Design an enzyme around this catalytic site. Structure first.
Site, mmCIF file in Angstrom:
data_model
loop_
_atom_site.group_PDB
_atom_site.id
_atom_site.type_symbol
_atom_site.label_atom_id
_atom_site.label_comp_id
_atom_site.label_asym_id
_atom_site.label_seq_id
_atom_site.Cartn_x
_atom_site.Cartn_y
_atom_site.Cartn_z
ATOM 1 N N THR A 248 -0.399 -20.317 10.358
ATOM 2 C CA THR A 248 0.787 -19.880 9.901
ATOM 3 C C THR A 248 0.916 -19.619 8.387
ATOM 4 O OG1 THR A 248 0.769 -22.407 9.606
ATOM 5 C CG2 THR A 248 2.600 -21.676 11.048
ATOM 6 N N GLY B 239 -1.372 -13.781 -13.492
ATOM 7 C CA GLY B 239 -2.304 -12.917 -13.602
ATOM 8 C C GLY B 239 -3.154 -12.417 -12.537
ATOM 9 N N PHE C 256 2.846 -7.355 24.169
ATOM 10 C CA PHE C 256 3.227 -8.647 25.035
ATOM 11 C C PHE C 256 3.538 -8.311 26.222
ATOM 12 C CE2 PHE C 256 2.591 -10.523 20.929
ATOM 13 C CZ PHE C 256 1.969 -11.559 21.146
ATOM 14 N N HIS D 92 -23.178 15.402 -4.233
ATOM 15 C CA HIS D 92 -22.333 15.942 -5.423
ATOM 16 C C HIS D 92 -21.222 16.586 -5.325
ATOM 17 C CE1 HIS D 92 -23.152 18.220 -9.436
ATOM 18 N NE2 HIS D 92 -22.694 16.918 -9.749
ATOM 19 N N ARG E 197 -0.287 -16.954 -18.057
ATOM 20 C CA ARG E 197 -0.549 -18.198 -19.086
ATOM 21 C C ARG E 197 -1.803 -18.346 -19.700
ATOM 22 N NH1 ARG E 197 -2.664 -22.677 -16.589
ATOM 23 N NH2 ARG E 197 -3.107 -22.742 -14.387
ATOM 24 N N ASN E 198 -2.655 -17.625 -19.221
ATOM 25 C CA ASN E 198 -4.316 -17.776 -19.964
ATOM 26 C C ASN E 198 -4.245 -16.295 -20.725
ATOM 27 O OD1 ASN E 198 -4.542 -20.293 -18.921
ATOM 28 N ND2 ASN E 198 -5.395 -19.573 -16.965
ATOM 29 N N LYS F 70 0.831 -1.177 -0.088
ATOM 30 C CA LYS F 70 -0.214 -0.062 -0.122
ATOM 31 C C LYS F 70 0.661 1.447 0.067
ATOM 32 C CE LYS F 70 -3.460 2.739 0.198
ATOM 33 N NZ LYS F 70 -4.524 2.367 1.350
ATOM 34 N N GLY G 169 0.693 -17.710 -7.511
ATOM 35 C CA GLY G 169 -0.127 -18.143 -6.219
ATOM 36 C C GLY G 169 0.641 -18.250 -4.949
#
Ligand SMILES: Cc1cc2nc3c(=O)[nH]c(=O)nc-3n(C[C@H](O)[C@H](O)[C@H](O)COP(=O)(O)OP(=O)(O)OC[C@H]3O[C@@H](n4cnc5c(N)ncnc54)[C@H](O)[C@@H]3O)c2cc1C
EC number: 1.8.1.12
Lengths: 492, 492, 492, 492
Positions: free
Chosen positions: D160, D196, D114, D461, D222-223, D61, D286
């Protein structure tokens, strides 16, 4: 862009048109004109051209002329003329058509006058007064009808003319005015004309000549002597001659109620109980100024005691830019007087050469049978405002009527002078020629002609008009209101 | 004692009678009047009352009136009047008989005026001068005939009028004049009136009305245009309207001889060579003063180079106490002029106020169909007299005639002006009503009216006379005698 | 023929146009629209399209956007971006031109919208109310100017919008409103904006970014805390952040008089004696309804205590066929609210499906730097009409502004609920994204969303809007008007 | 006594922390959390805070934000901002250093959380299951490494997350993933992002912003279309706008091998055969659940056929008292889902109210340039699920970008509907503000808002979000799965 109008005119009558023309062509002013129709006839009768062109002067003259032919045909026999007597037919339907075509001819010329004269535009509809500078056009006389125009105006001229006055008796819906008479499908067999005015007299002769066989024209009047306002002796004579020509003159009588018969004919009951049956009842009891449809209350225009519009010697009203001429003023209801007032209003405003119209010593006629010509004062009015009054009288039966067969047609001629200086204050003629004769007389009064000017002029012989030059001695006098023949030898 | 009067009048005509009546009733003088008949007709035609009453103004007016009915019957169809056209016909004998009755009535009244008026006595016979103070009354116009009376006269007034002039062509025996036309047994089928004057024209209309079927009135005049001395435009319009009614107008033609046919008709041969066969030949080329039988040479009364009795502005002849008036002076041959000439002669001689007849700006008429009314100068003469001359003009076919069918009947109304001040110099009208309109127009000219005094006057709607108060700008001008459509340059 | 208009509209603004379009294309009604200009700019500034299109929404957003770039350029350095620092130039003349071309683009589209949509016609000029069914168009706002149209009307819609309120101190002519600021030839070096409204704040940021070197934007307000009407804590924060960005926020101060210096700059004296010199003094002290030029007295339309037009839940007035929408009602001066009122007025009259517009729970923004987003009630108003009030607060400094160099840009988020049922009564955001975030929030309040609906929704990470789903516990309460942190354990 | 807790969390990530914090602060339980680092970076990248804080949502971001400044500097020219264009350049090291500081700050805060919260203890090391109730913490991911702790646990929570998937092509050694991209020493001149998905796309924009002169970002997939699972129209618009900014998109391409060049750059060879020379190859095809080092086989925790840890709707595994959340379950890999999954897990186990995370209608985002905001179903899926489907659509280039010059930046806003009732099934936005707009749009879908609830809402507006409250009629439909521009026939 197109702004307002240097002048808008409500009512395109005799006076209305003379004011918009003398402004569009004489002073290049923007001018609008609002009238409720383009052609003569129902439902509004009066249309573009005014009462004079549609339901007055022009069509009345044409019909009186046609009516004179009844006398002509009759009188020709004295001069050796013969033709099938029982074959004569007064075709009323043919007369009205010839009239309608004449009137419509005028309707179109004016119709084209607007279409080729910039600054001069015609608006069809009813003109009501909105603000003191806006005229409202509407599809009908109803103040709540649809609007088609709102004419911004610098000057506003009210020239709506006048309308026939109708009485408040039961069954008045079964009566007609001078308006509807011009359009009767057939000539009425029995007609009753109410009133003593020149309109009732003129139409009595017309109906009298074109009536089918078996007809009777009855004229009634609520007082003693008809034609109130005209010279006295002329009144009684015209009464006599109307009687001679077959017209029943029924004086001191007033209709009180009118009903319908099983055949559509009107049943008239009078205030004196006497009843009379007629096919047509025509009201000619007076003309009132036409102001109701104008909404004159929206601006606060002032009205005289009579329902007329108040004005001064220049046709101006209380509202600064609102003027009124013609019969709406309730003055001299004459066409040349509205054309004079109208032409005079313009070149006093758009020409800064103020000239007002003179309302005295004005010539008028009465195309009755026989006709009447007048100008100036009558004797009994001169009395109430003049020291010594002289009256010149002369009543010969005209040249030709010993042969004609109409011995009754006595021609009359009266002159009224101020006996002090002999100035002619009036001239009153009865008999054929009176209308054409009096016109040139009106110029004399405009020239302050004394009586000596008249009888010292060489006559045109043989004429009736020469009798005005043949009167050299008074027949009676009016001194301080009293009427005596000889003028008492007691001066100062 | 007896036969010693204040005034002896030869000729009980227009001027004569007016002279004597005023002398006897207004100034209580012993008056005697001489004339050859007490009633109209042959063999002397003129009679008590003058040419006007017996064979002039009065009779023709009635006969014109009767001829107007040919147009009336035809024009009435336009106004819805129907009747068998083929059944119309004019009875010429009934016209003459009716005219005789009317004229005879005047004859009867004028007599008895003598019987009832003291100091006024009539003498039947032929008057002539025997000495400066003696009138002889003989039984015939011949000096050799028997003396009836010798009247002593302090003053003698010649008032014998005029007589038809008859050209001395061969066959003149077979012609008539106006005198005998008033007494024809039957209306001529073919007739030829000779002369371009008002008599020939007026009579052409009468014959044209009463001609039997298949007739033809023919008027001839030796010059190119009829009615010399009248306004030219009117001269040419009356020519057109005459031709429009059936009358044929042969101009630049003068009869050269007449001869009898086997049947008894006439065979005219003109100078140019042509020939016409007609049933009557009426001569109306002029009228000459009737000095023939008066024996003026016995006293020395001088005649004018033109042939009339010479008189100054007060009607005085070269011989003291002898006076002349009327047609015998050969000035304006009109009845009102002689009358006025007579009334003035009496005021001057038997009063304490000299009076002389103004001979200019006299309104006269011409009873053609349609008629003519005029008064004052015409264009041509005004251009010979004044610096700048303006001509106001107006010519149209009235609406009433677009309907009657008589579309040729175009009204005309000229107005001649001195453009240096605007005073009206003359007025000329043509159409129905012209004679009556013009009468008061003579009062205005006596008052020196100006063109503005006419258009500034309010008119009488609707009439022919309006046209006079409606011409505001000159139709053309006459500067220094030359005609031009507009003026010179700027001026002022 | 062409009749009246099923509807005439004065003022072609946001509301005006939405009413005439939904009528000409949705209901085939005849519609007229009167506005005083076709293009943006002087002399009237507002023109065809309304305040929103010409001198409001559209051009303000464009200018604020351009003004944000001052912060962008500065903050890019934290992310590694370098460029000549002293070479940066905020070209105001280039910004105004880009703006003008954008606005005129809209001016023309509407300009064409009228030229290809029958029943929808545009009339240039000033619209004043004549009768209760006539609208008066005039060349100027002067009631005495020339007229160019008079629109007969069945229904009349008043949509003239609002106008900047100016105070009555000497020298107010030397001041400008929001109108004139859109057209300053150059960006003012020193500007003073008067008032605490969203307009004064939004223009303070714009001037602050485009000011030439050496400039100071001073905002003054007569009371203690600016942005009266918005949530409290958002007010004090925006004040802090405006100060951070260089704007001098001068509270408890009111101008008392303004004069001109020798160089044209304005000299401003306050009610507290302190003086300040500026090149521009902009008044943004409020907007009043624009009713003076309408002549509403001619029909008797009623006005509220404030100068606004009174209406009901359907935009109707006392006069039966006169309606009012937009800023002329003195209600929620927003553009979507006038488009909603306008679209709702039509299909309740011309569609007989009456549907009124809801005036509560309406989303609005405040494109300041930083921007504001609100919807619903604020906490202190909920107090005065709700038993138990819960307030949810959260004020993190946004993700990116530790790097940006703008630590001051603290983002804020408040939710206001009725603690009874947890229904959300308000939502108030400060920080970039607030305007775009709040819009979808307005749909939630229309759906009566309780607070549980918010924190039970899974967030979109990483965003600022996710903070609305991260508040599960109130920060304080408002119970019967009092404000205490802990909610006292004493029920019923 | 010691080392006996209520909950042990393997993974101090998004879901883990939320789970433990709620457990310890909301229910006073003894909690222990294990993670491999306390601060971001190599060699383990993920650390205390999870993938999101250290190498995910937070850092990208900031980096996207920094890449947006390439467009801002260029677009500012349209709003009058001038400066030397040639002097602009991006410092990639300053971006990384600034990002490190920000991420490190979160690391520092979470620690000390903590230190200051009793019952909440952190353990640095590698966690794995030793038995159904014992978590062992070793010194490295290897089971042969030293044991640091043995924690007794009544409940164990696996959290995890996931790990980059790297295809096993030759040369893969020469490639990187998202993890290492966050730490490059210099910006790659030529770079090839592979995949992608949203990671490849988002990073393509960052590299495109900071590439040195003469660089070229290249994305391959690949697609045939990038961003599978997103709304198609948005997929294709983002492809166009990416190509419009400089990014080349190689579709239907997949790398086959990489090799080193002499200089040290990379030589990619795709399957199709083509080749590209780039300086970096980033893999983003992925991410796979991080079950590798947990020793799940020692206990028998069953994995999904897709490879994640198998869990029911309450996050329970086949083994009692063991739970899993977040990326390790391989469902929706988003931070707020795990957080919500954690907070619900705690409420259920340590409360008296079962709660399960609703996984449908989750609003997510994609921070490309411009960004994407979406929520709910897309066209295709809705057509597989519902009878009649309506698609409301709106696409334009905002006005602000017609001025900025970025005219390709077309906004997009689809709305999928079930036309059988109107309920909104999904919303898809493209353009500036999309991520923020969509957040509240997730609250509405939880409320089952209908298409009417949106257009019946009053808008703000002027904003992009307005477009949602402005689509009233479907742009097309989806009946029984087939697309069509309009509906069937009549119905109702
Ligand atoms: C039977 C008869 C015979 C007459 N004979 C003579 C005669 O021989 N000589 C003579 O001099 N006079 C005669 N008159 C009188 C003469 O016709 C009038 O005096 C003359 O018309 C007056 O002119 P004016 O313009 O004022 O009136 P008008 O010419 O009548 O003008 C009125 C016009 O305005 C229109 N109008 C009215 N109200 C409105 C409105 N609200 N909006 C728009 N338009 C409107 C009318 O339709 C009409 O066209 C006669 C009248 C009558 C009735």
């Amino acid at each position: 862009m197109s702004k307002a109008f240097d002048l808008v005119v409500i009512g395109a009558g005799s006076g209305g048109l003379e004011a918009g023309w003398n402004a569009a062509t004489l002073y290049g002013k923007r001018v609008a004109v609002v009238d409720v129709q383009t052609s003569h006839g129902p439902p509004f009768y009066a249309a573009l051209g005014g009462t004079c062109v549609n339901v007055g002067c022009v069509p009345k003259k044409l019909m009186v002329t046609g009516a004179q032919y009844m006398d002509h045909l009759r009188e020709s026999a004295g001069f050796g003329w013969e033709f099938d007597g029982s074959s004569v037919k007064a075709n009323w339907k043919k007369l009205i058509a010839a009239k309608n075509e004449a009137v419509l001819d005028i309707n179109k010329s004016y119709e084209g006058m607007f279409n080729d004269t910039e600054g001069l535009d015609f608006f069809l509809g009813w003109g009501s007064l909105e603000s003191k500078n806006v005229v409202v056009v509407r599809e009908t006389a109803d103040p709540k009808s649809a609007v088609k125009e709102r004419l911004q105006a610098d000057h506003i001229l009210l020239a709506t003319g006048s309308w026939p006055q109708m009485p408040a008796i039961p069954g008045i819906e079964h009566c007609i005015s001078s308006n509807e008479a011009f359009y009767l499908p057939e000539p009425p067999r029995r007609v009753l004309t109410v009133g003593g005015g020149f309109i009732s007299v003129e139409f009595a002769g017309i109906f009298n000549a074109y009536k089918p066989p078996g007809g009777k024209v009855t004229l009634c009047y609520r007082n003693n002597l008809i034609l109130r306002g005209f010279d006295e002796t002329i009144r009684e004579e015209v009464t006599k001659q109307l009687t001679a020509n077959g017209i029943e003159i029924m004086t001191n009588e007033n209709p009180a109620k009118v009903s319908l018969n099983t055949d559509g004919s009107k049943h008239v009951t009078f205030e004196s109980g006497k009843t009379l049956d007629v096919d047509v009842v025509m009201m000619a009891i007076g003309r009132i100024p036409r102001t109701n449809d104008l909404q004159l209350g929206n601006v606060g225009v002032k009205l005289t005691p009579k329902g007329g519009v108040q004005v001064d010697e220049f046709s101006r009203t209380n509202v600064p830019n609102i003027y009124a001429i013609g019969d709406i003023t309730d003055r001299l209801m004459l066409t040349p007087v509205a054309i004079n007032e109208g032409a005079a209003l313009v070149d006093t405003v758009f020409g800064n050469k103020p000239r007002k119209t003179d309302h005295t010593r004005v010539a008028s006629a009465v195309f009755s049978i026989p006709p009447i010509g007048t100008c100036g004062l009558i004797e009994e009015v001169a009395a109430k405002e003049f020291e010594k009054v002289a009256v010149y009288m002369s009543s010969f039966t005209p040249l030709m009527h010993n042969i004609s067969g109409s011995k009754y047609k006595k021609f009359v001629a009266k002159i009224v002078t101020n006996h002090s200086d002999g100035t002619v204050l009036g001239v009153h003629l009865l008999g054929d020629g009176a209308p054409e004769i009096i016109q040139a007389v009106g110029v004399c009064l405009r020239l302050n002609a004394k009586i000596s000017d008249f009888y010292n002029t060489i006559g045109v012989h043989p004429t009736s008009a020469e009798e005005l030059c043949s009167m050299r001695t008074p027949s009676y006098y009016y001194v301080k209101g009293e009427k005596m023949e000889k003028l008492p030898d007691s001066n100062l």
